[PDB]
Design a binder for this molecule. Sequence first.
Ligand SMILES: Nc1ncnc2c1ncn2[C@@H]1O[C@H](COP(=O)(O)OP(=O)(O)NP(=O)(O)O)[C@@H](O)[C@H]1O
Ligand SMILES: O=C(C[C@H]1NCCC[C@@H]1O)Cn1cnc2cc(Br)c(Cl)cc2c1=O
Ligand SMILES: [Mg+2]
Ligand SMILES: [Zn+2]
Length: 493
Amino acid sequence: AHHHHHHSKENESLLGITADKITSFADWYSQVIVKSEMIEYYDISGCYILRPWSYFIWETIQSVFDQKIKQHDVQNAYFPIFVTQKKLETEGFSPEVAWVTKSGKSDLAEPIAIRPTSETIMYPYFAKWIRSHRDLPLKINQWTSIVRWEFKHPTPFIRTREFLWQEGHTAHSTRKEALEMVDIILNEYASIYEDLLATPVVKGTKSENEKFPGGDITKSIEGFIPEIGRAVQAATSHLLGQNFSKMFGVEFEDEKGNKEYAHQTSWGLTTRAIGVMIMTHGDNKGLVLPPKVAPVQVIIIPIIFKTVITEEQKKICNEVECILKKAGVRVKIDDRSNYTPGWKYNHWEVKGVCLRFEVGPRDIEKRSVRVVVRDNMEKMDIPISELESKIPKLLEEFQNRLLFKAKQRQNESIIRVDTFDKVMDTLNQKKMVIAPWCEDVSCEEEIKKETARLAMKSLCIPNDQIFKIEEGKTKCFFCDKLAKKFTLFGRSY
Ligand SMILES: Nc1ncnc2c1ncn2[C@@H]1O[C@H](COP(=O)(O)OP(=O)(O)NP(=O)(O)O)[C@@H](O)[C@H]1O
Ligand SMILES: O=C(C[C@H]1NCCC[C@@H]1O)Cn1cnc2cc(Br)c(Cl)cc2c1=O
Ligand SMILES: [Mg+2]
Ligand SMILES: [Zn+2]
């Protein structure tokens, strides 16, 4: 679905994308993020430079999500990047901890860990701040970078040794209020991917074998990349319960005067969202960005070459730019006489600009503009007097079309299998499995073991159970136990 629309002579250049998205996905992903000036590879493995074209999308994700959690009285703070070994020791993987072992030429007697997550940093101070039920709920969030020495092969955005993320940590007086906070954040995470990034995700609950061992319930949104047949956890929201409050002493005096441990939640979203969004919408021409996160929604390209644009040509472009600026549209004019219009067309197509305006003599004469849509090569002529109304509608239609097309690609990637004899062939088709499952830890341990023999794991137990179980008859697709619900399975990042 990547190489359907018309490619121009400049799209077939080396300044375009030469690797096919389906048959050469890894090379396609690298060319798309590099040639669009999103990412620069760094001489330290697993780290990638976030150029402004990609960092804008994170700033938009950060701006939109920060306003969302402020609706629930979540306050932003910043805790140090460092944490002692004693606090950190008591998905914690010791080989992932980046340790500062020297300052200058002086060795540290006790090395200091770089923050892989802030439970150890923050919770000793949650216990210090929380003495009464009146002090609850406490809701803290921080935007910061995280360093984890990932053992698996790094992927830009998806899995980086340094990534930018948001981590919210809340404490409540009741488990019910905490679980409501877990579901609230999960819906906002799903909104970030679907409403902002036009990326479909599946809301659900992690299995006992796949949940965060430090919490009671781990809910998540699962994404999927069909071109490689691997799911990707889009975000996560944990019902920590009292596991962390018991071990850090975060207790409060409830009403009537009894000491009770706090009911905590924690949730996180990283720059991985950008990578999942890129892989979802990008085609063989390069980036395809949702209008809500595209750094430039409209590029105005006057038909000029070598010489300077005429005075009436610059006046029309400024008028169109003024109309689009007043309408809240992010718009820029590319009046570089240095490049042919075809060069600019491919240049802003690789960068994923939603709409391009071609302004030539015929457009000046009619007081109209030639609009070319990025993702489907749709062409139309809009009068200048209609731009204020039509362009916000086109970007709105653009956003809906990306989510709708990405949705039907995800729905066709979910295959129902009721017996294990059809699971392996479904996985080999680069697709997920929705199967009747008993949800036992022992069952998933053998599911991972048997599928690794030809590994498949539970992605999430979806909140929306589209299929029904026979009360007392529907057995697990793998073992002899009765199936509880249907669970989404597949290989993941
Ligand atoms: N190295 C990474 N780079 C970018 N995003 C990441 C990375 N690791 C995790 N994430 C994302 O951040 C979210 C919250 O972090 P976390 O729950 O600690 O992931 P995780 O438990 O390490 N899962 P995983 O590392 O894939 O086994 C995850 O749901 C991922 O979507
Ligand atoms: O980090 C987590 C759980 C939650 N903490 C912050 C909010 C979002 C996030 O899902 C799971 N995790 C993952 N990787 C880790 C790596 C190391 Br090293 C350590 Cl010490 C700890 C962890 C660790 O705790
Ligand atoms: Mg990890
Ligand atoms: Zn089973």
